[PDB]
Design a protein around this ligand. Structure first.
Ligand SMILES: C[C@@H](Oc1cc(-n2cnc3cc(OC4CCN(C)CC4)ccc32)ccc1C(N)=O)c1ccccc1C(F)(F)F
Ligand SMILES: [Cl-]
Ligand SMILES: [Cl-]
Ligand SMILES: [Cl-]
Ligand SMILES: [Cl-]
Length: 253
């Protein structure tokens, strides 16, 4: 694991540090890395970074962004985390694009996201947290969908579940429902200017139907994930049993 084993193509994001698209010298494989400067970190914080990286390395699944390697450049006090390159980028940018272009996404694409994220979620629960939010969902070059490592103040918590408003794997189902709803409608199911107003809308549990281009069957399952009672939301298993979900909606190598 050395930095010289890879060549940077270009930077794809800056924030935490920066994310760059890179090329593995030995075989030409295209990857990315997260570049983190740990020079200002205490031993404690550096220690919580080690454990974190250890947690990233323990989850291997087709619908979870894959970790490849960790590289320490103790000279520039930089740590690189090497991960898979997702050519389609993140889902938040896809929604924004639809919103700005005034173009809804195909039902087929929504089903692929539902199927593959529900499988990612199933694997997360099996192990036991990674945020179910558009910015943390990635698309590769083969129609596959993968959950990233985000989560694993200023903002409105659009996706918080009713039971989290005050006090559960069913809560993850609510968040997935919010995500799929936003993918369809291009806006979250509950919106407001403050968290208090938001909590008011969430408690009432009312929202618009997703657009009419989407089947009553898809509207139905998203609506069930958004039930106020956690025990009326479908489990991972009940979601995957839905007649909408077919083999082609799953991942393929
Ligand atoms: C911080 C970063 O986090 C992740 C990034 C990726 N990731 C892997 N391949 C990527 C390709 C991306 O877009 C490329 C350039 C622009 N075009 C339009 C699309 C291809 C964007 C993110 C990608 C995977 C996992 C994570 C993670 N934290 O788990 C991130 C997160 C959300 C949006 C943007 C970024 C980035 F910093 F990479 F830009
Ligand atoms: Cl529109
Ligand atoms: Cl209602
Ligand atoms: Cl709404
Ligand atoms: Cl795959």
């Amino acid at each position: 694991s050395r930095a010289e084993d890879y060549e940077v193509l270009y930077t794809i994001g800056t924030g935490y540090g920066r994310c760059q698209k890179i090329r593995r010298k030995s075989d030409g494989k295209i990857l990315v890395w997260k570049e983190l400067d740990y020079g200002s970190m205490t031993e404690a914080e550096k220690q919580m970074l080690v454990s974190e990286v250890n947690l990233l390395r323990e989850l291997k699944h087709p619908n979870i962004v894959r970790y490849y390697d960790r590289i320490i450049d103790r000279t520039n006090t930089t740590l690189y985390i090497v991960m898979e390159y997702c050519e389609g980028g993140d889902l938040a940018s896809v929604i924004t694009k639809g919103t700005k272009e005034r173009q809804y996404l195909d039902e087929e694409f929504v089903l692929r996201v539902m199927t593959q994220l529900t499988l990612a979620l199933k694997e997360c629960h099996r192990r036991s947290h990674r945020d179910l939010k558009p910015a943390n969902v990635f698309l590769d070059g083969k129609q596959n969908v993968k959950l990233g490592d985000f989560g694993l103040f200023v903002g409105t918590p659009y996706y918080m579940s009713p039971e989290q408003m005050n006090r559960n794997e069913k809560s993850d189902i609510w968040s997935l429902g919010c995500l799929l709803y936003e993918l369809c409608a291009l806006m979250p199911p509950f919106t407001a200017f403050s968290q208090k107003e938001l909590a008011g809308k969430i408690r009432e549990g009312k929202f618009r139907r997703i657009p009419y281009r989407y089947s009553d069957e898809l509207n139905e399952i998203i609506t069930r994930m958004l039930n106020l009672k956690d025990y009326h939301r479908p489990s991972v298993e009940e979601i995957l049993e839905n007649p909408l979900i077919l083999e082609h909606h799953h991942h393929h190598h």
